[PDB]
A paper describes a structure:
The C1 map of the needle complex shows distinct tubular densities at the resolution of 5–6 Å in both the export apparatus and the inner rod and needle, suggesting the presence of α-helices. We used the recently published cryo-EM structure of the isolated export apparatus core from the Salmonella flagellar system as templates for modeling the structures of the Shigella proteins SpaP, SpaQ and SpaR. Random search followed by rigid body and flexible fitting allowed us to place five subunits of SpaP and SpaQ, respectively, and one of SpaR into our C1 map. Five helically arranged SpaP-SpaQ dimers build a turn terminated on the top by one SpaR, which has been suggested to resemble the fusion between SpaP and SpaQ. Analysis of the helical parameters indicates a helix pitch of 19.8 Å and 5.8 subunits per turn, similar to the parameters reported for the Salmonella flagellar complex and for the Shigella needle filament. We found evidence in our map for a 5:5:1 stoichiometry of the export apparatus proteins SpaP:SpaQ:SpaR of the Shigella T3SS. Comparison of our structure with the isolated export apparatus showed different conformation at the inner rod interface, where the N-terminal helix of a SpaP subunit occludes the opening in the isolated export apparatus, while it is bent and moved aside in the needle complex. We built a model for the inner rod fitting in our map a few turns of the published Shigella needle structure obtained by solid state NMR and EM. The inner rod has the same right-handed helical architecture as the needle with eleven subunits per two turns. We modeled the eleven subunits forming the first two turns as alanine polypeptide with helix-turn-helix conformation In vivo cross-linking studies in Salmonella have shown that PrgJ (MxiI orthologue, the inner rod subunit) interacts with SpaP and SpaR.
Residue numbers in the entry:
A (entry chain c), D (entry chain a), E (entry chain b), G (entry chain e), H (entry chain d): 6 to 213
B (entry chain f): 17 to 256
C (entry chain g), F (entry chain h): 1 to 86
I (entry chain k): 1 to 19, 63 to 86
J (entry chain i): 1 to 35, 47 to 86
K (entry chain j): 1 to 27, 46 to 86
Write the structure that this text describes.
């Protein structure tokens, strides 16, 4: 019954890109591009490519677990057994990760939503099925990523306020401070080691 | 049949604010085969078609034809657009004069209602009808062959009465708005503490809307006049 | 042709009503305070703006109900003459 | 000539979606979606599905004339006659429809465009073939649909101008008034029951 | 006659995605995304995927009724009977749902539109065919979802107005206040627990 | 449509309060110093702005949290009445 | 060898529109539209349209050379071989053009930066491939277009300076002089018949 | 195993465009275009086109390393062996390049990111795998390109501030000095021979 | 930079000529035409 | 909610110091001359952005670094 | 920060120079005469003024490749 495994493989990387990471990094990078003026990066090329690279990068530990247990075997050179424990154990790994970062509030509200969960009486979070687990995790990750990105946001707005206040204290009302902000922002963005530190912050103490 | 296809498809796409990207691309493609399967008929030529179809050079000619009409036919709408544009310049839109914000937002203010009014107004007499009649006239003039573009080069270099008709429409508007701005200056001279953004903007906005009312009526009649003018220009250009 | 002109006249008149009131309120506010930016002059730059904001907010408080009503009537009428618009 | 019938079963409902209806409905729905801000509906799924459903909805009576006379026999268990009179009579019904909504001006002008009808001198619009019937019909329907769509557009653009007017009056030179316009419009779109009434208007007194 | 079941299966997920849910969630989420400034989410990836997940999530109880009565048997390993009562009873459940959320006004307007309804003598709302039921339901769900979304819209527009008011009050005419808007909006979006309440609300008290 | 009118009135009143306090503080400061830009005039350009900043800063320091609270209440209500807004 | 010729045909007109013309006219008309206040013309319809029209017109004579020696030749009445020498000779004409207007400085920098020319040691400018030839020519056209564009720019800036001088001399310190600029510029833009002079000059005293 | 090589060929040029070059050139050119006022160039045509030409243009010496070892044979007219040493040696060249321009800090942080790198504890940068090499290089190139671009930025903003200072020193508070800035910038942009030096400097001191 | 100096010389001399009102605007007309002429002397 | 408020209070206090000094210089200038002056003001303000900048920037620098650190604990 | 600091200092000093000379040129009737002075500035100063910026700007991009 290899059919479903490979068809859902053709389907799945989209759902994965919506499933663990790839939310937070793309969000933060768009927040960064909302400063500095223009897009300043090609939305059709750069930020999404970076998102994919860093995404597989960060998932490499979960993929390592599935690589030892699941992935290495379906390499058609091992002629692996039909997928019974591959699905269940990869779901268990995804479960442990998801429950690392999913709220219970979302779990119970979505449980009342499915109305299979209400009749089935699910108590353990491992007894919540993967399909039920996914969107709650997505929403929780959205909230955390959003919090992180706007706490990032605050200082640049402080700088813009400073530039305006100075000009208007001198009375230079007719000016586009944004452009004068354009260089200064980047300075901090680079001068604070902020690019590398942001990447490492998200990366290392996202997973740990 | 392809030749008329790439005379018409240029027509349809090149002429968007008559038939635009609001229409799904799957509905902008079939009109080509429609109008062509109409037009192409009675041109029954059975000859030996070149290796690789050297008459691809003929294709070049056909494309240009469609494009011509569209941009020239864009003059009417645009004169109205220009009218609306300049008026909102003295009211609100020109505050995007500054280094690049997010998108051209203030395009949408006023001129788009003019675009809708002008595009609807065609449909009393004809929306796409006169364009296609002139195109059939071009079919009569230049059906096809190697001699591809007679005098198209100097036909292209031409003059269009864009701002001429814009002024014909908006003369008293612009003069009165100039006078009102000078009245704002007299208000400043009366008291040097006005900080015009504290005062002027509301007044010029309200005045702009009132004048747009009376000029929409004058627009109806000047529109029929403008339609006749552009018809003459197109007759000249396609016959030359 | 004629019906389209009727449409445009009515539309611009509705716009005239709703866009007319608050902008006139703001006009009166700015002119009056600028006249108070005379004797006992007291010009910094911006000050009258503040009252301007108040006025417009009060405008939406004062007018609102019948304002909505206006659109409703015409909007219903629009769909009616939809069947005579073809 | 059974082959043609079934290969056209594969192909033709697209040409039909460009043939009688499906134009004005999709157009009007796109007009509805170009206000209110973004797409706000899934361009690839919802509006197209609605157009198809409503269009077959419209055409149930012409297909009913065919169901009595044409459809019941080409049930492939009957091995029905090659489609001469099936086509001719369904086309008679389609003709009555098309001439319900085709302008004579467009008829004559496109007849001159074809150079077929101009030489052949066709007088009855039933003597205009479906081939000649199609383009004038499509263009006339386009004119009617654009008229209807912009008359629908009117109040929403009025609201946009209103909010922009208040803002430019208050000196709100920098704002995206579109967003303030986004909610107000729909109040009318919903509160006047204009969605149901508009569907009814086009639907019924299109057919009548 | 297994054919039609599987062909209409290949057809049907589109019609279902346009037929009960998935309208309102996608609508509301694009509406959320017109706040906060830019798209800020991938239109081609995230939100529509969330809509799909929540879609099947929500529809699971109707599928549970069908799981008891329909779904369990057409599992091709059970060799199930041709679909007589599967269709009838799943249609009964779908009917009760659609008539939970369809206006009768739209029902009668499309009744006159089809002219199928006028001749076929349709009296009960269960005697209106599913085909007739679909577009009216779509219209009504459009109205409800739209109204919900724009009533969600208004406050962020209020905040934008406030920021612009402050800026122009001190005279910072030349600014793009939107960016200074971006952080504050988020806090409320997070501080209200608002996306979680939104999902829970739509989910639980859509179905109930 | 009555409900829509009530909605607009409520939202605008909340705007009134939230935009009422801080600009009122700024207005008080600017009025006092501008009146001191009269007798003993000493009017150059900008000076009161500095004191203005103090007040404005304190406002954004002191007011913020409970101010958001206002929206909190209304926003929660909306979601609830979402189910009765259908 | 039809395949690659036709695939690169699907691809190439973009690179051509970036290859000879189309830069300078677009920049010129954008500089024209940056005076007069707003865009005052459709960014998305007319002006770059004229750029394309003038571009194809201006590239007509290269196509005339390729018309005598290539575009007359593929005929069955000419009994032609597949496209070997057609491409070579059209490229020779294109080469003569590109070397009409390409710098040597840019050429050598671009030679060694590809390192294909650096290690391969190319001597003739015809031995520099078209790919290496394009971007340097584009850069030189950019510099010339910019010179002409800002020397277009000067007058309306002078008008604005005059208006500001008037207002400040009369004590009209508070004004947005740009608006007063709008009509006068427009009048001048017509009153000297200058748009036609600009277009005729650009076309003719470009190509002749 | 020709399949993967050619499918990933269809896939890859995007990832390459995000992988070595194409970042810095496009970024810098957008920085150039945010001076001089408007877009001043076609966003959808010219600058990124120049970036692509300059991109593979620049990538050619690595391709020469392969031309000796990889490229010559996958010219499919050579019928070349399966890709064993092609991949290894192209990866070695890519390794030496990436290590020319990759920081160690990013390397270690992203190694802790991957968490297979943390478990495996890789020491040599040639022992970092290619996928491990990619995103650290992306981050480093981002920092370098951003530094370059905003260092280019600074003088034009200086000019803007100075013109404002002049006008305000003269009491001309009401002006949009940006437009008067527009011509002056161009002359510096040319008067230095500065774009040629920029292109040459990127050129050689990127590769050498 | 000297060419810019000359352009500004002409333009500012005309500003001097200006700073009666109505016909004064007419002066600009003349120079505007001349500007476009030396447009093709900018390259 | 409380912690977010504390964060904003820190940011606003840093704003307070940075925006405190130069406007006090300009205040002194304008009071003295009002008891033309714009020119003197220009000097001071200009000098401020030259004179104060480095360590002033340093303030933001320090705090910005700290933010990124606790970015990891903001989850 | 080091190169950043150096760059910022140098840019601000160049700003000081250019913004310093025009009022020395400048040194309601007489206002009109004063206008001529500012105009003459762009006549008199510009070329070598540009040279100033020119020099530094050139070096910047050069040391751009060593500023990383």
């Amino acid at each position: 019954s290899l059919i479903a495994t490979l068809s859902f493989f053709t389907l799945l990387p989209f759902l994965v890109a919506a499933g663990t990471c790839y939310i937070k990094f793309s969000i933060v990078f768009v927040m960064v591009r909302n400063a500095l003026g223009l897009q300043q990066v090609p939305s059709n090329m750069t930020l999404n490519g970076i998102a994919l690279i860093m995404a597989l990068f960060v998932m490499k530990p979960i993929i390592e677990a599935g690589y030892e247990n699941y992935l290495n075997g379906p390499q058609k050179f091992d002629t692996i057994s039909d997928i019974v424990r591959f699905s269940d154990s990869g779901l268990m790994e995804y479960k442990q990760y998801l429950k690392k970062h999913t709220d219970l509030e979302l779990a119970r509200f979505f449980q009342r939503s499915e109305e299979e969960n209400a009749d089935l009486k699910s108590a353990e979070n491992n007894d919540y099925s993967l399909f039920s687990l996914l969107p709650a995790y997505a929403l929780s990750e959205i909230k955390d990523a959003f919090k992180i990105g706007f706490y990032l946001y605050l200082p640049f707005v402080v700088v813009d306020l400073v530039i305006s206040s100075i000009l208007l204290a001198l009375g230079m009302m007719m000016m586009s401070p944004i452009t004068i902000s354009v260089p200064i922002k980047l300075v901090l963005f680079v001068a604070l080691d902020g690019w590398g530190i942001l990447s490492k912050a998200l990366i290392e103490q996202y997973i740990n | 049949l392809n030749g008329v296809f790439f005379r018409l498809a240029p027509l349809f796409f090149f002429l968007p604010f008559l038939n635009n990207g609001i229409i799904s691309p799957s509905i902008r493609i079939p009109v080509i085969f429609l109008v062509a399967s109409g037009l192409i008929t009675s041109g029954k030529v059975d000859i030996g078609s070149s290796v690789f179809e050297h008459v691809y050079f003929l294709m070049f000619k056909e494309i240009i034809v469609g494009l011509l009409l569209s941009f020239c036919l864009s003059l009417p709408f645009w004169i109205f657009h220009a009218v609306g544009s300049i008026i909102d310049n003295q009211r609100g839109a020109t505050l995007s004069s500054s280094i690049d914000p997010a998108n051209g937002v203030d395009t949408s203010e006023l001129a788009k209602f003019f675009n809708l009014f002008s595009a609807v107004v065609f449909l009393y007499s004809g929306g796409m009808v006169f364009i296609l009649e002139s195109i059939q006239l071009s079919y009569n003039i230049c059906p096809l062959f190697s001699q591809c573009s007679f005098r198209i080069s100097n036909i292209l270099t031409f003059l269009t009465l864009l701002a001429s008709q814009a002024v014909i429409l908006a003369s008293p508007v612009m003069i009165v708005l100039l006078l009102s701005e000078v009245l704002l200056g007299v208000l400043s001279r009366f008291a040097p503490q006005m900080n015009a953004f504290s005062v002027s903007l509301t007044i010029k906005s309200l005045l702009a809307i009132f004048i747009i009312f009376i000029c929409s009526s004058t627009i109806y009649f000047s529109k029929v006049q403008f339609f006749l003018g552009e018809h003459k220009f197109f007759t000249n250009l396609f016959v030359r | 042709m004629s019906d389209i002109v009727y449409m445009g006249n009515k539309a611009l008149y509705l716009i005239l009503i709703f866009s007319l009131w608050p902008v006139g309120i703001a006009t009166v506010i700015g002119l009056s305070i600028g006249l108070l930016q005379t004797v006992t002059q007291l010009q910094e730059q911006t000050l009258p703006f503040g009252i301007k904001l108040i006025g417009v907010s009060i405008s939406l408080l004062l007018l609102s109900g019948w304002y909505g009503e206006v659109l409703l009537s015409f909007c219903h009428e629009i769909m009616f003459l939809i069947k005579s618009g073809v």
